[PDB]
Amino acid sequence: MEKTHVQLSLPVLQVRDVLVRGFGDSVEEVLSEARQHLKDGTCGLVEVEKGVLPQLEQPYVFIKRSDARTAPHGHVMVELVAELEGIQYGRSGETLGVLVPHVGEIPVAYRKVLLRKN
Ligand SMILES: Nc1nc2ccc(F)cc2s1
């Protein structure tokens, strides 16, 4: 009875503050853990710039834009895509950032998203 999408406000973290630098050790695990942390309100977002990904741990979980016409209630529609060793699991639009566990780091902003569940 999970609605297909959920409105979330994600804390945006600076990469050097992140204490837990990924969600796990395989593509399936990181997608599973990302979904669980999103559900629990314990997921942050790191915006990708030069130097960011080498400071985080693979596999990566990205949120990517899933369409261009609808940003309901100010929230960009996104979906999850994982990456390991240059191979991506899913295809989607432009990256908004990389998801990481949030364990109390102080954010620099919040990013409003409408996230596709499954
Ligand atoms: N299967 C599920 N994925 C998500 C992703 C995000 C969320 F908030 C809840 C759920 S339940």
Q: Which whole-number Å values give the CA distances from 78 to 1, 12, 19, 26, 55, in the listed order? A: 20, 15, 25, 22, 24
Q: 3-state SS string over 92-111?
A: CCCEEEEEEECCCCCCCEEE
Q: Is the Cβ atom of 35 under 6 angstroms away from ligand 1?
A: yes
Which residue type does 29 have? Answer: E
Hey, how many other C-beta atoms are within 10 angstroms of the C-beta on 46?
A: 22
Question: Is there an atom of ligand 1 within 6 Å of 16 CB?
Answer: no
In the block, tokens 């432009």 appear at 94
From the CB of 6, is ligand 1 less than 6 Å away?
yes
Q: Which atom of ligand 1 is nearest to the CA of 39?
A: 8
Q: In which element (H, E) is residue 11 found?
A: strand 5-12
What's phi and psi for 19, nearest 5 deg? -85, -35
The whole-angstrom separation of Cα 44 and Cα 22 is: 11
Q: Name the experiment that determined this structure.
A: X-ray
Q: Residue 51 is encoded by which pair of tokens?
A: 């130097």
28 C-alpha to ligand 1 centroid (Å) = 14
Delimit the domains of the chain by residue range. Answer: 1-118
Q: Of 74, 90, 33, nearest to 57 (Cα)?
A: 33
The upper half-sphere exposure of residue 111, i.e. CA atoms within 13 Å in the direction of its Cβ, equals: 25
Closest Cα to atom 8 of ligand 1? 39
Q: Which residues pair with 92 in a beta bridge?
A: none
Tell me the three state secondary structure of residue 10: strand
- Contact 3 CB / ligand 1 (< 6 Å): no
Residues 6+ apart with CB under 8 A from 21: 55, 56, 57, 100
* 3 state DSSP class of 12: strand
What resolution in angstrom units was achieved for this structure?
1.1
